[PDB]
Design a protein around this nucleic acid. Structure first.
Ligand code: URA
Lengths: 50, 220
DNA sequence: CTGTATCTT
DNA sequence: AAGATAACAG
């Protein structure tokens, strides 16, 4: 039901983990917000906030 | 050679296991002795010789646990979801979903227990014949002991059923990546919309692990 | 008909 | 905890 939108979010999180440059503040915001979302939704995930 | 035994009062008398399970076998024996008489009053799915066969699996090569509630109300084999026939609702839905995901369209069956990376698990190890969840009261403390043990080893835990697993975190000390989806036998058509198998592979990449190859599950 | 979980009172 | 609910196979 909601697992498609969960997938979409996780994909984007993974896309950002890969693309992300520390110099880009908007990416870090988006990424950190996805890591929070991901962490609280699945309890624990393999990546950290930066 | 990796396969130790241990003994218990009531049927099935011996339990064989693999070294990976050694830490839990003491409390398991203690616990199984306190309840076995009671649960054995009922005919069960699976039969008692099969309650523990999943203990012969190693854990150290496992990164995903796929966890159901309890055995099929009828004709459980002791391997979660396994239907030697390919007649049970639940493995059929799971097989469809993998089909959509992978492109494999011709298959005879599907089995979650022949997949590198994966341990299929049932939270409760038996039910009275024909009655889902009938033995939850007996398995309870044992269920919690084994799941906690399993989750020390794997990266991802995928629980099949919103009703029985919405409170699953309370069940475990120690956080582990945990996804709770609709059960395949849900009575609307909710498992057809579940994306959880993809979702596991994405989660696995995020923990720097190899994706599960779900195609390995098909029986041709 | 019965056999195979979810959600809201 | 109790009741209403859905759909599909057999
Ligand atoms: O083994 C099984 C079979 C059906 N449903 C489950 O949750 N587990």
């Amino acid at each position: 039901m909601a697992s498609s939108a969960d997938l979409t979010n996780l994909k984007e999180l993974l896309s950002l983990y890969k693309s992300l440059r520390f110099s880009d503040s908007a990416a870090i915001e988006k990424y950190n917000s996805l890591v929070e979302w991901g962490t609280s939704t699945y309890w624990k995930i393999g990546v950290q906030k930066v | 050679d990796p396969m130790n035994s241990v003994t218990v009062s009531h049927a099935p008398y011996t339990i064989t296991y693999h070294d990976d399970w050694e830490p839990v076998m003491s409390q398991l024996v203690e616990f199984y002795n306190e309840v076995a008489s009671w649960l054995l009053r009922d005919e069960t799915s699976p039969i008692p010789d099969k309650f523990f066969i999943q203990l012969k699996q190693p854990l150290r090569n496992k990164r995903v646990c796929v966890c159901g509630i309890d055995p099929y109300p009828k004709d459980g084999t002791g391997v979660p979801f396994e239907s030697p026939n390919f007649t049970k609702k639940s493995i059929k839905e799971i097989a469809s979903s993998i089909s959509r995901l992978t492109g494999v369209i011709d298959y005879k069956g599907y089995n979650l227990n022949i997949i590198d990376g994966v341990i299929p698990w049932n939270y409760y190890l038996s039910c009275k014949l024909g009655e889902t969840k009938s033995h939850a009261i007996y398995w309870d403390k044992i269920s919690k002991l084994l799941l906690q043990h399993i989750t020390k080893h794997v990266s991802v835990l995928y629980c099949l059923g919103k009703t029985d697993f919405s409170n699953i975190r309370a069940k475990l000390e120690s956080p582990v990546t945990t996804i709770v989806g609709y059960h395949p036998a849900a009575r609307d058509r909710q498992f057809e919309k579940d994306r959880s198998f993809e979702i596991i592979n994405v989660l696995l990449e995020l923990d720097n692990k190899v994706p599960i190859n779900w195609a390995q599950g098909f029986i041709y």
